Design an enzyme around this catalytic site. Structure first.
Site, PDB file in Angstrom:
ATOM      1  N   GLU A  14       5.934  -6.709  17.680  1.00 35.73           N
ATOM      2  CA  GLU A  14       5.009  -7.455  16.815  1.00 35.73           C
ATOM      3  C   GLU A  14       5.069  -8.952  17.112  1.00 35.73           C
ATOM      4  O   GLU A  14       4.033  -9.611  17.155  1.00 35.73           O
ATOM      5  CB  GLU A  14       5.284  -7.182  15.339  1.00 35.73           C
ATOM      6  CG  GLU A  14       5.264  -5.699  14.952  1.00 35.73           C
ATOM      7  CD  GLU A  14       4.019  -4.958  15.447  1.00 35.73           C
ATOM      8  OE1 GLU A  14       2.945  -5.569  15.634  1.00 35.73           O
ATOM      9  OE2 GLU A  14       4.118  -3.727  15.660  1.00 35.73           O
ATOM     10  N   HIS A  31       3.004  -9.593  20.008  1.00 40.48           N
ATOM     11  CA  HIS A  31       1.579  -9.641  19.707  1.00 40.48           C
ATOM     12  C   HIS A  31       1.197 -11.063  19.250  1.00 40.48           C
ATOM     13  O   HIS A  31       0.147 -11.568  19.633  1.00 40.48           O
ATOM     14  CB  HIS A  31       1.190  -8.578  18.666  1.00 40.48           C
ATOM     15  CG  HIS A  31       1.011  -7.205  19.245  1.00 40.48           C
ATOM     16  ND1 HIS A  31       0.462  -6.953  20.485  1.00 40.48           N
ATOM     17  CD2 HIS A  31       1.331  -5.989  18.735  1.00 40.48           C
ATOM     18  CE1 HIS A  31       0.476  -5.638  20.669  1.00 40.48           C
ATOM     19  NE2 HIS A  31       0.998  -5.019  19.623  1.00 40.48           N
TER      20      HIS A  31
END
Ligand SMILES: [Ca+2]
Ligand SMILES: [Zn+2]
Length: 197
Positions: A140, A143
């Site tokens: 994450e 990202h």
């Protein structure tokens, strides 16, 4: 050129219940994850600094929902309204024991490094193996740094790496050449100032 990323991990109330209120047990769990991802990120020439660890032992500061998208949005907004004024950091991740709707175990904004309300991600404490959760955490955060999922021949020795669209026993705790490339070109192109210090 080395980049430095000051992060804060936020642990919600469902996590505190899951761990029977044992704050030290929670700290050890989170610390081991940070140890794991610090190594993975060093290979992208990004130094990770744990600026803080916040535990919502009294009650949640946001409504964490089964909807991952709702929770992500609420978390970023709370971060911008409250967290950034208490601790200086570049990125924050929420660790929750909540089981989100569908196959989702983590969600994050893409290419949002340094954005007050968007430099965040949400991760479910989905496994009893610390390594698997650490990988989702790294995923994450990646990202946020503008990296997308691996595909084709992207590899990190083997082909199942951190940016794999699926988390499993066979996921290697390292980023692929593809992730390295994408990450460095984002930094090169966007050059978010908050990770320059
Ligand atoms: Ca910084
Ligand atoms: Zn992903």
């Amino acid at each position: 050129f080395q980049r430095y990323m000051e992060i804060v991990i936020v642990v919600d109330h469902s996590m505190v219940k899951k761990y029977n209120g044992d704050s030290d047990s929670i700290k050890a769990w989170v610390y081991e994850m940070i140890n794991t991802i610090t190594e993975s990120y060093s290979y992208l020439k990004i130094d990770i600094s744990l600026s803080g660890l916040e535990i919502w032992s009294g009650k949640d500061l946001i409504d964490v929902e089964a909807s991952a998208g709702n929770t992500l949005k609420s978390f970023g907004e709370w971060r911008a309204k409250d967290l950034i004024h208490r601790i200086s950091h570049d990125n924050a991740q929420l660790l929750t024991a909540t089981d989100f709707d569908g196959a989702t175990i983590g969600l994050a904004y893409v290419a949002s490094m340094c954005n007050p309300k968007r430099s965040v991600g949400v991760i479910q404490d989905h496994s009893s193996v610390n390594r698997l959760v650490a990988i989702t955490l790294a995923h994450e955060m990646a990202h946020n740094l503008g990296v997308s999922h691996d595909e084709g021949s992207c590899s990190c020795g083997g082909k199942s790496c951190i940016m794999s669209p699926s988390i499993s026993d066979e996921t290697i705790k390292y980023f692929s050449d593809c992730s390295y490339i994408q990450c460095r070109d984002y930094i090169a192109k966007e050059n978010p100032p908050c990770i320059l210090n």
